[PDB]
Design a protein around this ligand. Structure first.
Ligand SMILES: *Cc1c(COP(=O)(O)O)cnc(C)c1O
Ligand SMILES: *Cc1c(COP(=O)(O)O)cnc(C)c1O
Ligand code: NA
Ligand code: NA
Lengths: 428, 428
């Protein structure tokens, strides 16, 4: 990789949420292996991010690799209209089996945002079919559900700058962000906001949508499981659908197979993505109940009106099947538990740094919230120099590493974060 | 695939736009090679659909395969935030190079619908940065832009059943579907409807969005290039962005590399999907002008507000690079031209058939519109018994074969269509 390449990237290639006129450096990656990324210049970095949650088995994994190659030899893709195939059936078998009982109807899609759009459309078509006028969504503040219009409409209005689409995006209902902590005590006073909204709008709410336990992109918040119990009961009582968006929490990340398990509840609709394929390629799934799938099909439309071109892509399905096969071994449980203990122990010291607001950990997620925002270019460079890849945002320096990360490798990530927060150099 | 597997699929697996209560037959495909799909019982089907436009090089292509397997050895995926990599760079060089000059900034995304969503958000943010109150889209009737909420808002209100979502979708402006055929003379009376809208709302329109030349999912309609020439001019005059959605028309399909060429015009925003990866896996691209990309960034939000987790996916990018490399050889041009001749010649006779409402052909697209809807289950079955894979819908029996289809294979397709439309058997 040459510098002319880098210049082409800078002037012609957009990257996620970053300016084009005023870019910030980017690092060339040539390959990746185990828990390491490899830059063009030969520098090896311990990945603390799993490429944004997804790469839970790390990189160049032999089982994922083998699964993908063998599928390519059968067929990379065939359309799913009027056709079915083994990778899709196997995957749906696994997804149905590993999730709560009521969740038994699978809609495969390409991306997490699309999975959410699917969930939202199911909710909408569901009520239309029952002849009830329900078009509104009730969601938590500090939530994040994707970047497409529908998903944007249920993301934190401040966190996502809704003043940009003010007038274009429907106005949903935003209850306060859960205050009670996964770590601490429950407080009944936390429920009043949501109760008020639900009481004042029960008749127009199609669905409640939330990220179970962890609100990821909107603040890496970790809230008390009683919230989900409560929400599930309120939805049951009112006859309203519950959508759990586990695109981030799914597949072991919080120490349980799905974060819903922390409350022992089942949503009516479940959105999955990111780690689904083990971070090899994009795939998503939206699962729902029989009651929802059948109601939709028996109404005016006569079907659920969605179908991405690449729905059920065999290759992505093979990768997912292989990712899930690793998880079937149950090994992830102790791997995540050990990562939890190690994050708690090693991030603790950060609590005494001047720049640190909070330190929270759940499963293989460890977060250091800062008092001031990070200086991106600056902190990212520091992290690279330490031989680690960490992608901080706002006031959040966090770790979500692969489950197979070696205690030594994790020790490196933790040392770098501690060292990053010891003065204001990398802040503002 | 056991019968139990197929039982599981019917009961638990949602397919595109179909009922979960009154499910129609699906066919179990184990692999694919060349232009053929292979079922579980060993039977081979000539593929007339390109797995919905995308597999322009057929299946199990040696080149595509090796490029995919090679990327897998380096890294199937890594995150795109603060990181760049060879496949994305190479892919973006080609897209910029192969498209009109003004289009030099690429936003890579996961799927078509998302690419459209991206295009729509650019337009809104563009006008946001210029402090202009523009949130309406102007599009054509019979248009299709994807299944996500934003994309649905510019899809045909009828074809897409807007009644279902009345109240959730922003209400855009819909001008009459292009009357003048790509096969015929131009009637300036065709412009009234559009002009009437463009006037009364020129103050409100953020962008004009249309599929160039071929309105695909909305009716496989083929209209005269003059519409594009005129639309561009009107957009230039009012200073309105033009979004050309070429997710279906891109990469050779209509006889030109890009359908926009048929009118030698250039969009402000261009959406690419489907055939981009040679139908191996999902990937999309939205290209735009420096002016748009800079405006947005130098805007108040500071960047373009969008970023899919799997943005720039190396594996997909390398499949796309291999696919474009095949197009670089230039063969598609005559491969497509020949297909167009064969389609024109061999579908001609369907015009003597009683169930046929119209026959139209453009590039590697052949359409036999019928007077009555098809019996999907019965027709598909007939086609499979004739050794071909054709996916009809509504009143359209159409073909979009791989560019590498042999003439005798193309012949079994067109014969199958001709035989299907002779009477009422497979209809209503
Ligand atoms: C990442 C994420 C999404 C969206 O996934 P994309 O694949 O980026 O569209 C949606 N919801 C949550 C909670 C996520 O974390
Ligand atoms: C198929 C198509 C889309 C949608 O692409 P998906 O990948 O199915 O989301 C958008 N626009 C046009 C013209 C299309 O043909
Ligand atoms: Na289940
Ligand atoms: Na160009």
């Amino acid at each position: 990789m040459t510098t002319d390449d880098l210049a082409f990237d800078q002037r012609h290639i957009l990257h996620p949420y970053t300016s084009m006129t005023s870019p910030l450096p980017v690092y060339p990656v040539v390959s990746a292996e185990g828990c390491e990324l490899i830059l063009s210049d030969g520098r090896r970095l311990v990945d603390g991010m799993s490429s944004w949650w997804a790469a839970i088995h790390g990189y160049n994994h032999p089982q994922l690799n083998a699964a993908m190659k063998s599928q390519i030899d059968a067929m990379s893709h065939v359309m799913f209209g009027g056709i079915t195939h083994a990778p899709a059936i196997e995957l749906c078998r696994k997804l149905v089996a590993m999730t709560p009982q009521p969740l038994e109807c699978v809609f495969l899609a390409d991306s997490g945002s699309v999975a959410v759009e699917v969930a939202m459309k199911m909710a909408l078509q569901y009520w239309q079919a029952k002849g009830e006028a329900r078009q509104r969504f009730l969601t938590f503040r500090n939530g994040y559900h994707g970047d497409t219009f529908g998903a944007m409409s249920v993301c934190d209005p401040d966190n996502s700058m809704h003043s940009l689409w003010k007038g274009y995006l429907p106005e949903n209902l935003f209850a306060p962000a859960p205050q009670s902590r996964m770590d601490g005590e429950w407080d009944e006073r936390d429920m009043v906001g949501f109760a008020r909204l639900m009481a004042a709008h029960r008749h127009e709410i199609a669905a409640v949508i939330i990220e179970p336990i962890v609100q990821g992109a909107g603040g890496m918040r970790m809230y008390h499981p009683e919230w989900l119990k409560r929400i599930r009961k309120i939805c049951d009582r009112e006859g309203i659908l519950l959508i759990a968006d586990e695109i981030a929490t799914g597949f072991g990340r919080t120490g349980k197979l799905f974060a819903c398990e922390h409350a022992e509840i089942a949503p009516d609709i479940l959105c999955l993505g990111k780690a689904l394929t083990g971070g090899t390629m994009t795939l998503s799934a939206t699962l729902t109940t029989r009651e929802v799938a059948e109601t939709i099909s028996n109404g005016e439309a006569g079907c659920f009106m969605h179908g991405p071109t690449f729905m059920g892509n065999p290759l992505a399905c093979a990768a997912a099947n292989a990712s899930l096969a690793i998880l079937e071994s149950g090994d992830w449980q102790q791997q995540v538990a050990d990562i939890e203990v190690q994050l708690r122990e090693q991030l603790a010291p950060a609590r005494d740094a001047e720049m640190v607001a909070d330190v929270r950990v759940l499963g293989a997620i460890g977060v250091v919230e800062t008092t001031h925002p990070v200086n991106m270019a600056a902190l990212q460079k520091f992290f690279v120099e330490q031989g680690v890849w960490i992608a901080p945002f706002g006031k959040l320096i966090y770790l979500m590493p692969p489950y197979i990360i070696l205690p030594q490798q994790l020790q490196r990530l933790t040392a770098a974060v501690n060292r990053a927060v010891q003065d204001e150099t990398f802040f503002c």
